[PDB]
Scaffold this motif. Structure first.
Motif, PDB file in Angstrom:
ATOM      1  N   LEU D   8       0.514  -1.406   0.185  1.00 30.59           N
ATOM      2  CA  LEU D   8      -0.188   0.144   0.259  1.00 30.59           C
ATOM      3  C   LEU D   8       1.454   1.249  -0.561  1.00 30.59           C
ATOM      4  O   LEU D   8       1.628   1.246   0.812  1.00 30.59           O
ATOM      5  CB  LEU D   8      -0.802   0.119   1.405  1.00 30.59           C
ATOM      6  N   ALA D  10       1.520   4.753   1.255  1.00 28.62           N
ATOM      7  CA  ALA D  10       0.310   6.437   2.669  1.00 28.62           C
ATOM      8  C   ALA D  10      -0.067   7.665   2.260  1.00 28.62           C
ATOM      9  O   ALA D  10      -0.933   8.188   2.601  1.00 28.62           O
ATOM     10  CB  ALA D  10       0.934   5.745   3.360  1.00 28.62           C
ATOM     11  N   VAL D  11       1.018   7.811   0.460  1.00 28.65           N
ATOM     12  CA  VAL D  11       0.702   9.294   0.648  1.00 28.65           C
ATOM     13  C   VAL D  11      -0.474   9.964  -0.617  1.00 28.65           C
ATOM     14  O   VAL D  11      -1.150  10.045  -0.297  1.00 28.65           O
ATOM     15  CB  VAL D  11       2.404   9.237  -0.430  1.00 28.65           C
ATOM     16  N   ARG D  12      -0.297   8.371  -1.821  1.00 31.05           N
ATOM     17  CA  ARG D  12      -1.575   8.692  -2.096  1.00 31.05           C
ATOM     18  C   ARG D  12      -2.723   8.102  -1.525  1.00 31.05           C
ATOM     19  O   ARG D  12      -4.215   8.009  -2.695  1.00 31.05           O
ATOM     20  CB  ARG D  12      -1.536   8.174  -3.707  1.00 31.05           C
ATOM     21  N   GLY D  13      -2.588   6.744  -0.645  1.00 26.75           N
ATOM     22  CA  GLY D  13      -4.175   6.123  -0.430  1.00 26.75           C
ATOM     23  C   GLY D  13      -4.055   4.975  -1.339  1.00 26.75           C
ATOM     24  O   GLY D  13      -5.898   5.146  -1.876  1.00 26.75           O
ATOM     25  N   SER D  14      -3.313   4.542  -1.905  1.00 29.80           N
ATOM     26  CA  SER D  14      -3.874   3.351  -3.238  1.00 29.80           C
ATOM     27  C   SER D  14      -2.695   2.660  -2.586  1.00 29.80           C
ATOM     28  O   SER D  14      -2.107   1.977  -2.064  1.00 29.80           O
ATOM     29  CB  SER D  14      -3.495   4.433  -4.314  1.00 29.80           C
ATOM     30  N   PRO D  15      -3.915   1.139  -3.483  1.00 33.01           N
ATOM     31  CA  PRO D  15      -2.884  -0.076  -3.613  1.00 33.01           C
ATOM     32  C   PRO D  15      -1.290   0.572  -4.475  1.00 33.01           C
ATOM     33  O   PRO D  15      -1.592   1.843  -5.415  1.00 33.01           O
ATOM     34  CB  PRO D  15      -2.517  -0.616  -4.478  1.00 33.01           C
ATOM     35  N   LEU D 101       3.256  -1.231   3.823  1.00 38.86           N
ATOM     36  CA  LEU D 101       2.608   0.454   4.408  1.00 38.86           C
ATOM     37  C   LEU D 101       3.865   1.255   4.229  1.00 38.86           C
ATOM     38  O   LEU D 101       4.555   0.833   4.605  1.00 38.86           O
ATOM     39  CB  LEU D 101       1.834   0.337   5.875  1.00 38.86           C
ATOM     40  N   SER D 103       5.412   4.876   2.595  1.00 36.90           N
ATOM     41  CA  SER D 103       5.655   6.291   2.823  1.00 36.90           C
ATOM     42  C   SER D 103       7.465   6.542   2.486  1.00 36.90           C
ATOM     43  O   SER D 103       8.055   6.003   2.679  1.00 36.90           O
ATOM     44  CB  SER D 103       5.414   6.541   4.102  1.00 36.90           C
TER      45      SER D 103
END
Lengths: 115, 115, 115, 115
Positions: D8, D10-15, D101, D103
């Protein structure tokens, strides 16, 4: 359904099963109105909280009862609950997955927003 | 001071500076009473929110204003704020460090509790 | 010292004390050469691993011996260790704080890089 | 397949899509032998890395090429890659999901091990 919640247990490395949660929508009087609730399944997921029709733009709060989860495992936790507060925005087609990763004295939460 | 909050920015690899937060304490009538507030320093820390005398047993909420933080950096984040809700001092006085690690669509929060 | 490591225990809400770690630097022949090692203190921190003079540009690996940590507390964890691999000082000398947050089946690691 | 990896952003909130990774198995000479590899799908997941027959007990390393992922987004990252090192244990029926996850200056990884 445009909103799904998934909860993981970082101590046992497992889905967090039977975790209760309540979803609220902010009302015009700036108070939290109950919107939906449920408990996670054996896969740690809670589906069917709302529908595309009902899930209009606004500010939502997901309150995850993490304290009761740890107490049922005999583990003393730090937090009363985990809170996830966000604005639903219509922009284009969007589905929201709220993930929560739980430890007794720490949690993380992530939003995966997809089309 | 028995309560300190530290905030890190996981995009920049830096302390999160000038992050506002508001602390509340649950009153006898189950409402959130304002308790303390402040902003993080250049070190990402907020010290001096309270004193051992004032920080009695109770349920506290730390509301970290993450959305304003990201917006000032040009980022539209997912969460409105990060909430940290916990019972404090119910086994006697403790020192609490609340850490928050921030990304636009994810955050984690950890408590370090020392006697 | 331009390199410090801090380790927290997310089960206990405490610094992770006596956590061993080994630091390596990639050599010209692409092998990992031992660079420094130590254990975290009562504060969960390991200071003094290196000096500004010795900590030249390169690729470094911090191997945090998390499995031994959990086993001593009676826990059989998932990971063998936590590895943190990064290029250091390639834009000039910096100070690096590597943080690790540990749970038996999950960990996070964050870098704070200051000039 | 007993091993799946999910990544995932965490910056774009996407796979995290098209993230390359390599899996290694520790050999008797204590060197890392290539075992399997692939890239994540549009769902951020990498399936079909191995089979129940081939995935015998041993020590495995999943090396996730996070630096190339961030570089393709024009974001300077801290880590060279994310490394997940663990022992596969036969105990009973078991499936392994490794979640990561990401970042730029932080990542978390979690193992969800289910029957």
């Amino acid at each position: 359904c445009p909103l799904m919640v998934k909860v993981l247990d970082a101590v046992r490395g497992s889905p967090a099963i039977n975790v209760a949660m309540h979803v609220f929508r902010k009302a015009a009087d700036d108070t939290w109105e109950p919107f939906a609730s449920g408990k996670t399944s054996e896969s740690g997921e809670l589906h069917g909280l709302t529908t595309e029709e009902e899930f209009v733009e606004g500010i939502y709060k997901v309150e995850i009862d993490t304290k009761s989860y740890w107490k049922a495992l005999g583990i003393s936790p730090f937090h009363e609950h985990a809170e996830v507060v966000f604005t639903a925005n219509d922009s284009g087609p969007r589905r929201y997955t709220i993930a929560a990763l739980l430890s007794p004295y720490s949690y993380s939460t992530t939003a995966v927003v997809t089309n």
